[PDB]
């Protein structure tokens, strides 16, 4: 069982959020995790609750949702124009062609071009972003030595130089992304609390 709550983005500003309870039966358990947006398809059902009647004074029933599918809406506000419960998954025909696109000789540079095409220049920034998106390979040497396998990028530029737009694009494109701003983040907001 999970307690669904209205997303802060949709709730009217300043008002309290409503919530409902969703029941996830086998094969749907652990698909959703705390702190994540989701799109739940299910059956709206009601049953008798004695305590609710006792507190309210009227014969009001209790309502729940019986989940039938879940779609992870977190960090995908710009992918709402897409079918399926997963927008980063592939058919058997889409990966028989991700393998033609990739034998061609200049994919390493048509990929860099396709990074935030609505930004005019900044080839180095786009190359760094592509490298970070694809990332390196982690390796545990003999089970004793751990070596990081991901690439970190820093953009240190002038005011109107299309940095935040690049960050927003990377948020759109990555499988799992979270956006944080300077003073809107805390030491335990990042990491764990």
């Amino acid at each position: 069982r999970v307690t669904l709550q209205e997303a802060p983005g949709t709730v009217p500003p300043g008002r309290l959020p409503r919530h409902r309870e969703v029941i996830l039966l086998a094969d749907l358990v652990d698909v959703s995790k705390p702190g994540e947006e989701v799109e739940v398809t299910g059956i709206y059902k009601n049953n008798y609750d004695g305590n609710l009647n006792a507190k309210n004074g009227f014969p009001v029933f209790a309502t729940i949702i019986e989940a039938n599918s879940i779609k992870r809406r977190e960090g995908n506000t710009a992918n709402e124009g897409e079918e399926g419960l997963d927008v980063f998954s592939w058919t058997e025909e889409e990966e028989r062609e991700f393998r033609k696109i990739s034998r061609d000789r200049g994919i390493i540079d048509k990929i860099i071009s396709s990074m935030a095409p609505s930004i005019y220049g900044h080839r180095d920034i786009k190359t760094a972003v592509a490298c970070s998106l694809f990332g390196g390979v982690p390796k545990n040497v003999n089970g004793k030595h751990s070596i990081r396998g991901d690439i970190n990028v820093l953009l240190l530029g002038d005011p109107g130089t299309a940095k935040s737009q690049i960050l927003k694009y990377v948020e759109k494109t990555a499988h799992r992304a979270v956006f944080a701003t300077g003073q809107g983040a805390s030491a335990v907001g990042l990491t764990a609390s």
């Binding site: 992918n79 897409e82 927008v87 980063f88 998954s89 592939w90 889409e94 990966e95 991700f98 696109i101 990739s102 048509k110 990929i111 071009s113 396709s114 095409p117 609505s118 005019y120 220049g121 900044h122 180095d124 920034i125 760094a128 490298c131 970070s132 998106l133 694809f134 990332g135 690439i151 970190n152 990028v153 820093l154 953009l155 240190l156 530029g157 002038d158 005011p159 109107g160 130089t161 940095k163 494109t173 990555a174 499988h175």
Partner: protein
């Protein structure tokens, strides 16, 4: 930080010329006014092809496949 990218804004008339042209063309392209679902998808594809050699959705799936 593996990569440091320093960005500078310098006034070069030729550089300002290209950037302004691109920005104005982009604003024109993104204007809202500029089967039904099939026609909408086709026009969106035509608009997207002008600036990106690879479709963005195909690119997302490709990146996920490569990382997996």
């Amino acid at each position: 930080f593996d990569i440091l990218c320093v960005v500078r804004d310098l006034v070069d008339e030729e550089a300002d010329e290209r950037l302004a042209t691109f920005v104005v063309d982009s604003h024109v392209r993104s204007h809202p006014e500029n089967n039904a679902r099939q026609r909408r998808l086709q026009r969106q594809r035509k608009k997207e092809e002008e600036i990106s050699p690879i479709p963005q959705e195909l690119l997302m799936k490709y990146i996920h496949y490569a990382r997996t």
